[PDB]
Design a protein around this nucleic acid. Structure first.
Lengths: 77, 76
DNA sequence: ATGTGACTTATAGTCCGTG
DNA sequence: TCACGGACTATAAGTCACA
């Protein structure tokens, strides 16, 4: 899956920009630390609701997240 | 009771009706069961990103177009 | 046509760990 | 702190019999 690797790239990018650990993100997302790791390393198939939890844990608006996703989708060569 | 979910379901339906397609046509094109797509449009199915990809492919819409439409629906 | 409850099967997502 | 794995539970995927 093409889209999952882009979602998971954007998640890890924002997390690092915010200086958050995977545990910080797990805690603010109401998700397990190993699930955050799984998402980032293995581009796990998130639900819409868990994606929403994560964007909330990253403290980014949905719009900003989806604009970054679009950027990552349009990246080429 | 999810803000994002209600926006995603509204966009899938909006594009489906824009393409003049029935849920059954969408089922055919996405290889998903029509009663499964009904549940999504009715906001009663927390779909994964994989399922959303099959739906977007079924709608013959690019990810970028779908996301731009989702952004606009979020801003309304 | 679409909608829905009530399922079975597959997997999202949690919990217990390690080096 | 995080990659990685076993084993588990909660819930999504997928289906159908109605409505």
């Amino acid at each position: 899956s093409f889209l999952l690797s882009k979602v998971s790239f954007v998640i890890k990018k924002i997390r690092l920009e915010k200086g958050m650990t995977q545990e910080d993100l797990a805690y603010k997302s109401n998700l397990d630390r190993t699930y955050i790791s799984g998402i980032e390393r293995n581009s796990r198939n998130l639900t819409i609701k868990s994606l929403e939890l994560i964007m909330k844990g990253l403290e980014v608006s949905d719009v900003v997240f989806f604009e970054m996703l679009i950027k990552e989708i349009l990246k080429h060569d």
